[PDB]
């Protein structure tokens, strides 16, 4: 394989004479240098892991690196200072600091100019980390919420220009506030151009996605492929007007990028370039779990999968260090976990712990979330989870069936439960959920629902706020940054008109995913609406997490509580929590206490709790302790 310092002379070839010896002695180019010696040796080889002798592999790789070197030289002096910042502050991530939010532009601003008059509110709120939804040119009609990408670089019209982005972006940096967007690198819409000219045989896009003349071999594949949304088709293919089938693990207007193809790898790179100039922050890499298909296996979590991300990531290393990935797997919690690392995605959504807070909601019992809070929570160093409550998505219970089973508990059975509960077909159940993607032949179920409509606050459940605090206290502090659903902090409800719009009548998703709700939003400081109560209680616990340098980093050990309804872990050994998951009081005996100080101050209630006497937490309670 080629090394760093060869292939820099050639990308130099470029230039004149007498250009280079200019080249050679510019700062951007020392930057650029330093870094290839430092992360190439990555690059190369997780691509030869890959592709190993293809044909392609050292001709795309040098492409790629003049176009690197292209993009680095133009990327903005601001930019270069972010790159440099970043380079040092690796764990800039794991800061108590930080707290983020997420939102539809649409939806929660109209468009990109109003989305950047509400970055007073998102200052207000407290917000370092602003997440917004997929901009970018996709199909009328249905694009899965934007997530069928007709383009990687043309914004949505809808939602404004590429100079309304950025303007927000640069807007966002000035409030404080970083910039993240996703990167769908696994799949674009069937009206992208490159899937046109693939389908329509262009011979500079052949083998861009996996296109079969008939059914034989998506057959064999559909032996072992999960369905995602079983309710649009079965298996993992959809097949076109000329009668070929293509790969479509989502729905079928979205063509799933062909890996396999390192002109692929080169092209999603140029488009990432592409993002990391425009000033993002950090880019979601949607579905990290399918880049690499393999017959016989589920195509999911393969091996290349890995390395191709790791090799995504070495490209930021070299041409924009700023740039970070957060990965979004929803998948097995042994799966999970292996896509965060420094050298891959350095923070990912931590669905194991969302999903067990609305476990713990219906049950009661702590078990689960303890044991996942015990063994599944702490991450190597420079990463971080994201923890959150809800998101744009449906949530699924991606729980490990072993990890239940060593607790006596049935998987299958679990879940059949936890749907029921949360479509509010189980007696006394306080959720309003919505089902989402019920497979007949597997029994699989998501569920569907904004926050406030899981924990009762539709039909105003007096434990609704309440609940709503106790979740994301816990998302707010068990270390790692917290990701807000914007709408939560006020009590949104779920969206009354999705059911009857034929656009969005087949996708329960959009159950969740309401517009700007200006009554509520109007009514949060008001102690006496729910909205208030929420966002005040909140925000009081944002302010706390980011003064409080107890709640620093990631790492946290659980404290055993002695009560299976109460939940207890500890930050830098200075913070004991407690979040009573009972809609009735519950105790922490004296005598579980009997190791911690006499007395600690609360920062939740602000009073000072005595602990050498029996503890007691009304329902829902959450209680943030100094023992240190
Ligand atoms: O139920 C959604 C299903 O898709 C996943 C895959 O990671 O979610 C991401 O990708 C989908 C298809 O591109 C998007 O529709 C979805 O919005 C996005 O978060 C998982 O959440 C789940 O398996």
């Not at 003049?66 to 601001?78: F, L, P």
């Not at 609406?529 to 706390?544: E, F, K, P, S």
Request: proline fraction near 5%; hydrophobic fraction near 40%.
């Amino acid at each position: 394989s080629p090394n760093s310092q060869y292939l820099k002379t050639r990308i130099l070839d470029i230039y004149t004479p007498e250009q280079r010896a200019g080249i050679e002695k510019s700062e951007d180019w020392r930057q650029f240098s330093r870094r290839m010696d430092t992360h190439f040796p990555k690059l190369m080889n997780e691509l030869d892991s890959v592709y190993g002798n293809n044909e392609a592999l050292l001709p795309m790789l040098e492409m790629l690196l003049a176009q690197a070197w292209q993009s680095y030289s133009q990327r903005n002096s601001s930019l270069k200072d972010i790159d440099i910042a970043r380079e040092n502050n690796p764990d800039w991530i794991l800061s108590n600091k930080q707290v983020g939010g997420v939102c539809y532009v649409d939806l929660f601003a109209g468009d990109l100019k109003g989305l950047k008059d509400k970055i007073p509110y998102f200052q207000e709120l407290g917000l370092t980390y602003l997440y917004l939804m997929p901009l970018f040119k996709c199909p009328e009609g249905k694009s899965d919420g934007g997530y069928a990408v007709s383009s990687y670089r043309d914004v949505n019209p809808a939602l404004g220009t590429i100079g309304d982005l950025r303007e927000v972006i640069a807007a966002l940096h000035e409030a404080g506030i970083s910039a993240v967007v996703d990167f769908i690198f696994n799949h674009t819409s069937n009206e992208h151009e490159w899937a046109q000219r693939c389908a329509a045989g262009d011979p500079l896009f052949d083998n861009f996605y996996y296109i079969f003349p008939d059914r034989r071999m998506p057959d064999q594949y559909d032996r072992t492929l999960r369905e995602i949304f079983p309710d649009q088709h079965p298996g993992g293919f959809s097949q076109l007007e000329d009668g070929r089938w293509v790969w479509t693990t989502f729905n079928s207007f979205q063509w799933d990028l062909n890996y396999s193809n390192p002109w692929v790898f080169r092209a999603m790179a140029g488009e990432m370039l592409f993002l990391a100039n425009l000033g993002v922050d950090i880019l979601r890499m949607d579905a990290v779990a399918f880049i690499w298909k393999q017959m016989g296996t589920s195509c999911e979590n393969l091996p290349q999968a890995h390395a191709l991300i790791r090799a995504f990531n070495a490209v930021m290393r070299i041409a924009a260090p700023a740039v970070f990935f957060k990965s979004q797997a929803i998948v097995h919690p042994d799966q999970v976990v292996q896509y965060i690392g420094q050298d891959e995605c350095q923070i990912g959504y931590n669905p194991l712990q969302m999903a067990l807070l609305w476990n713990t909601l219906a049950t009661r019992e702590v078990n689960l979330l303890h044991q996942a809070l015990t063994y599944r929570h702490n991450l190597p160093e420079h990463t971080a989870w994201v923890n959150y409550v809800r998101s744009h998505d449906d949530i699924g219970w991606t729980f490990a069936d072993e990890d239940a089973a060593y607790l006596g508990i049935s998987g299958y059975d679990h879940r059949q439960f936890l749907n029921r509960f949360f479509v509010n077909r189980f007696d006394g159940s306080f959720a309003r959920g919505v089902p989402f993607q019920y497979n007949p032949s597997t029994g699989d179920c998501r569920v569907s629902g904004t926050a406030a409509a899981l924990v009762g606050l539709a039909q105003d459940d007096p434990h609704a706020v309440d609940r709503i605090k106790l979740l994301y206290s816990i998302a707010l502090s068990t270390g790692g940054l917290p990701l807000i659903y914007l709408g939560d902090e006020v009590g949104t409800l779920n969206d009354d008109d999705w059911s009857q719009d034929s656009n969005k009548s087949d996708d329960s998703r959009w159950a969740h995913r309401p517009r700007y709700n200006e009554a509520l939003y109007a009514q949060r400081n008001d102690p006496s609406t729910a909205a208030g109560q929420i966002y005040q209680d909140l925000r009081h616990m944002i302010a706390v997490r980011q003064s409080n340098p107890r709640f620093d980093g990631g790492r946290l050990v659980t404290f055993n509580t002695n009560n299976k309804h109460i939940i207890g872990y500890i930050r830098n050994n200075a913070l004991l929590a407690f979040g009573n998951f009972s809609e009735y009081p519950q105790t922490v005996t004296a005598h579980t206490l009997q190791a911690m100080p006499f007395k600690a101050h609360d920062l939740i209630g602000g009073k000072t709790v005595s602990l050498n006497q029996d503890l007691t937490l009304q329902p829902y309670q959450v209680m943030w302790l100094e023992i240190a």
